Amino acid sequence: NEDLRLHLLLNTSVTCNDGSPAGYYLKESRGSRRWLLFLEGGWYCFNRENCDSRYDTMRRLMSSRDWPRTRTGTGILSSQPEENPYWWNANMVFIPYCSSDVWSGASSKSEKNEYAFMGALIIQEVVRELLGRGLSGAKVLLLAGSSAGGTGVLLNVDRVAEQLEKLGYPAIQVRGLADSGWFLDNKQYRHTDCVDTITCAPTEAIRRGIRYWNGVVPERCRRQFQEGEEWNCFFGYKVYPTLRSPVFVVQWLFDEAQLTVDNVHLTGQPVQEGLRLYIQNLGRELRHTLKDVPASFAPACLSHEIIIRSHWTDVQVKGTSLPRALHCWDRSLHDTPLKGCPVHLVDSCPWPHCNPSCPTGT
Ligand SMILES: Cc1ccccc1OCC(=O)Nc1ccc2cnccc2c1
Numbered sequence: 001n002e003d004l005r006l007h008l009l010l011n012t013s014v015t016c017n018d019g020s021p022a023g024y025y026l027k028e029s030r031g032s033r034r035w036l037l038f039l040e041g042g043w044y045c046f047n048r049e050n051c052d053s054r055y056d057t058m059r060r061l062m063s064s065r066d067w068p069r070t071r072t073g074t075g076i077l078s079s080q081p082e083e084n085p086y087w088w089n090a091n092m093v094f095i096p097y098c099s100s101d102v103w104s105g106a107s108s109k110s111e112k113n114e115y116a117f118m119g120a121l122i123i124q125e126v127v128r129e130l131l132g133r134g135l136s137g138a139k140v141l142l143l144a145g146s147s148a149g150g151t152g153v154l155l156n157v158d159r160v161a162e163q164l165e166k167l168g169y170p171a172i173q174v175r176g177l178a179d180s181g182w183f184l185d186n187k188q189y190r191h192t193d194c195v196d197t198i199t200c201a202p203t204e205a206i207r208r209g210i211r212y213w214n215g216v217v218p219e220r221c222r223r224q225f226q227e228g229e230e231w232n233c234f235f236g237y238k239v240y241p242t243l244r245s246p247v248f249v250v251q252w253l254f255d256e257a258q259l260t261v262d263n264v265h266l267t268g269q270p271v272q273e274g275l276r277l278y279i280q281n282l283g284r285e286l287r288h289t290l291k292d293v294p295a296s297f298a299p300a301c302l303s304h305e306i307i308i309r310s311h312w313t314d315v316q317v318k319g320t321s322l323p324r325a326l327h328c329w330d331r332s333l334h335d336t337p338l339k340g341c342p343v344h345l346v347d348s349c350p351w352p353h354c355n356p357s358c359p360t361g362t
């Protein structure tokens with residue numbers, strides 16, 4: 001029985017995009033004081049037309065009406081040590097992404113809003129409801145997430161810490177694990193002005209999204225960038241230095257979503273000099289942004305997401321797997337580097353699949 005069970009939120013004002021209740025899937029582990037709260041990813045929408053299209057063909061990302069009663073935990077959400085060497089005995093929570101707002105929104109469906117964008121409030125409400133289901137006894141709350149959910153970790157981890165402090169639980173240690181959500185606002189390989197969804201670069205799409213969602217960002221980052229510039233806080237290398245909670249960053253050096261938003265579409269044809277240099281510079285820039293991130297795992301592979309994949313234990317950087325690096329991170333946060341137990345693991349080779357342990361794509 002690997003199953004997490006669905007609970008729809010008791011506060012029915014906290015909703016998915018279409019006004020159906022948001023929710024969470026939970027598998028308790030009696031007697032563990034560790035809680036893993038995972039934020040699903042799945043891109044985002046930023047205006048009426050592209051949200052309407054998402055509602056037709058990605059409806060589970062906008063509504064709870066068709067969610068199943070259970071889900072199987074995989075990767076870091078597995079309860080089997082064979083699959084999850086890191087946290088197999090933890091309390092497991094999977095929070096479906098049904099707000100299409102990179103977990104940033106704070107707006108309800110109303111006479112002026114066709115859709116609700118409540119991602120930031122969904123996280124707060126899940127935490128509130130879990131406190132009565134055992135989270136009050138926690139020693140560590142790891143807020144994890146992949147893709148848009150990894151960016152969601154960066155945007156929300158300090159708010160979870162603040163919420164728990166204000167509710168009277170200052171002993172729960174809040175930490176973040178951001179997988180595949182560390183994007184660059186870099187020069188694109190080909191460029192289009194923002195005239196529709198597919199042509200709109202991330203900085204422009206997110207600047208529009210924040211206004212459409214009533215998006216919120218972490219306070220220290222908001223104070224740096226100020227009004228109109230909060231889109232900056234969606235880029236990991238800019239928001240990370242403002243955060244107080246410990247955050248472990250997992251990012252492929254050649255992330256497929258980064259390449260997509262850079263207008264790079266590989267085709268198996270030979271790569272010529274311009275694109276070769278572009279890809280190599282992308283890996284170098286990503287590595288440079290991680291230079292001062294002490295807890296990080298960044299393999300030289302063309303891929304996207306890792307922590308909820310069943311074979312997540314297979315990739316290694318410098319001979320260390322991700323479950324090992326996460327364990328070393330836990331040790332480093334006990335009340336000086338550790339012999340043979342590294343936490344900063346960034347590949348230096350310059351081309352996808354120069355690391356032989358990269359996912360095969362099979
Ligand atoms: C939060 C964020 C900041 C910066 C960059 C990306 C970010 O989120 C992920 C993202 O945009 N993902 C996708 C996924 C599929 C796509 C297909 N076609 C075009 C664009 C697409 C974009």
Ligand SMILES: *[C@@H]1O[C@H](CO)[C@@H](O)[C@H](O)[C@H]1NC(C)=O
Pocket residue numbers: 011013014121125
């Ligand atoms: C329900 O959620 C809304 C929106 O986040 C919040 O303002 C309200 O206080 C919540 N109600 C309760 C009882 O928690």
